Amino acid sequence: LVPRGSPQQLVERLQEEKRIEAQKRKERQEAHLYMQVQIVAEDQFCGHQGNDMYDEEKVKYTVFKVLKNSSLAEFVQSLSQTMGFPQDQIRLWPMQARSNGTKRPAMLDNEADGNKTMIELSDNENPWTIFLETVDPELAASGATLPKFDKDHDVMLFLKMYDPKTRSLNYCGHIYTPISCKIRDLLPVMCDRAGFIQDTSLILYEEVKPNLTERIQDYDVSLDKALDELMDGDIIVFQKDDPENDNSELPTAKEYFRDLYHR
């Protein structure tokens, strides 16, 4: 339709048009001073049937145009207001590319490295991908802050459940676990998240990279001794130790990832 309105409304519409025009022109010229920040939430992790946290093409990001010389605290504060979550309920884990070609979340001190600029933390990476960790909507409502994480002794291990009967991977979230903690002690948490009976026999693997799924033969050892080069973002793939799996197309997780690699 043709434009209609009072002189008050016409001037206001013209003032708003020039305001956007001036803001867009400044953004076009100051383009070199800004960097794109891609935020990926844990809901993009469930449903993924391949290697790593998500498929680089299927994943949905919340992109933020951040100035390069802005501090980490400046970004967290702006992210907290836009997402609708308090600062104590959120934590940032930047997606860092490993030497083997895998993209996993890395540890970042949201308190000590707060003074550091967004450009130095990203290492001149444009766009920069960060995993936003949030407390469950049920737990976050009951005034519960994000659990305490020790950068020197605690690690963030991601859990995946493989079902040979349905040829599928089922995301079982992440866990804050100390390095000294034994693999045997992590078994009830795996049975809990997968929806299995207490003390169910499991076969454990480490998703190192596509085609490499190494089996954890001993559960009586700590996380550091069982997983080589133990870091934040390491994946543990578990499945039932049942004779029903033998009749299936891909009885093990190791055979599943090998089939996925040669697709």
> What fold is seen in the domain 147-263?
Ubiquitin-like (UB roll) (3.10.20)
Mapping DSSP onto H, E and C, the string for the chain reads CCCCCCHHHHHHHHHHHHHHHHHHHHHHHCHHHEEEEEEEEHHHCCCCCCCCCCCCCCCCCEEEEEECCCEHHHHHHHHHHHHCCCHHHEEEEEEEECCCCCEEECCCCCCCCCCCEHHHHHCCCCCEEEEEEECCHHHHHCCCCCCCCCCCCEEEEEEEEEECCCCEEEEEEEEEEECCCECHHHHHHHHHHHCCCCCCCEEEEEEEECCEEEECCCCCCEHHHHCCCCCCCCEEEEEECCHHHHHCCCCCHHHHHHHHHCC
Tokens representing 246 are: 């033998």
Burial 228-263 (b: 16+ CB within 10 A, else e): eeeebbbbbbbbbeeeebeeeebbbbbebbeebeee
Are 193 and 172 contacting, i.e. CB atoms less than 8 angstroms apart? yes
Domain positions in the chain: 34-146, 147-263
Q: Which of 104, 134, 108 lies closest to 122, judged by CA?
A: 108
C-alpha–C-alpha distance, residues 206 and 227, integer Å:
7
- The C-alpha atoms of residue 236 and residue 174 are separated, in whole angstroms, by 10
State the Cα–Cα distance between residues 255 and 86, nearest whole angstrom: 43
Start-to-end C-alpha separation, the chain: 53
Q: What torsion do the CA atoms of 219, 224, 228, 231 make, to the nearest 10 degrees?
A: 120
Strands 154-163, 212-215: parallel, antiparallel or unpaired by DSSP? unpaired
Q: Which two tokens stand for residue 195?
A: 């929806």
**Number of Cβ within a 10 Å radius of residue 58:** 11
Q: Are 200 and 192 in contact (CB under 8 A)?
A: no
CB 238 within 8 A of CB 159: yes
Method used to solve the structure: X-ray
Nearest to 241 by CA among 251, 249, 255: 251
Task: Please check whether residue 222 is in contact with residue 253, taking contact to mean a CB–CB distance below 8 angstroms.
Answer: no
Task: Return the structure tokens found at 1.
Answer: 């339709």
